[PDB]
Amino acid sequence: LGKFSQTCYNSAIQGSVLTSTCERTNGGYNTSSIDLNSVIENVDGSLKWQPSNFIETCRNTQLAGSSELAAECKTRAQQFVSTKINLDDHIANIDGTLKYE
Ligand code: NA
Ligand code: NA
């Protein structure tokens, strides 16, 4: 539920990054930044908060075969339907370590 702006000042945005100077519980101020690239997305030209983790609206996640993520997920109509996504689309082996591409 946020409300940072109420107890912060000198807020600015540069690219995807918010910086602000915010009141500590016990009197001081601290300047910090948050990168909004992980929490906001462009949907057809409108900035939207990114949905909560898919694990909150999906169940029975499994690996199907060698690279498919399979689950049942809630539609906006609140019904569960079967869905799958090929993790080979974007998950790479970078020298022994799994990395998102
Ligand atoms: Na500071
Ligand atoms: Na700081």
From Swiss-Prot:
In solution exists as a metastable domain-swapped homodimer which very slowly converts into a more stable monomeric form at room temperature. Under physiological conditions it is unlikely that the dimeric species exists and indeed the monomer is more active against HIV. Interacts with HIV-1 gp120. The keyword Disulfide bond applies. This is Cyanovirin-N. Mannose-binding lectin. Disulfide bonds join C8-C22, C58-C73. GO terms for molecular function: carbohydrate binding. InterPro entries: Cyanovirin-N (IPR011058), Cyanovirin-N_sf (IPR036673). Keywords: Antiviral protein, Disulfide bond, Lectin. Its activity in situ is unknown, however it acts as a viral entry inhibitor, inhibiting HIV-1, HIV-2 and simian immunodeficiency virus (and some other viruses such as feline immunodeficiency virus, measles virus and human herpesvirus) infection and replication. It prevents essential interactions between the envelope glycoprotein and target cell receptors by binding to carbohydrates on viral protein gp120 and possibly by other mechanisms as well. Addition to cells must occur before or shortly after virus addition. SMART domains: CVNH (SM01111). One of its GO terms (biological process) is regulation of defense response to virus. Belongs to the cyanovirin-N family. It holds the Pfam family CVNH. Cleavage, or reduction and alkylation of the disulfide bonds results in the loss of anti-HIV activity. Overexpression of this protein to provide quantities adequate for medical use as a topical microbiocide has been attempted in a number of systems including E.coli, Lactobacillus jensenii, the yeast Pichia pastoris and Nicotiana tabacum; see PubMed:20162270 for a review.
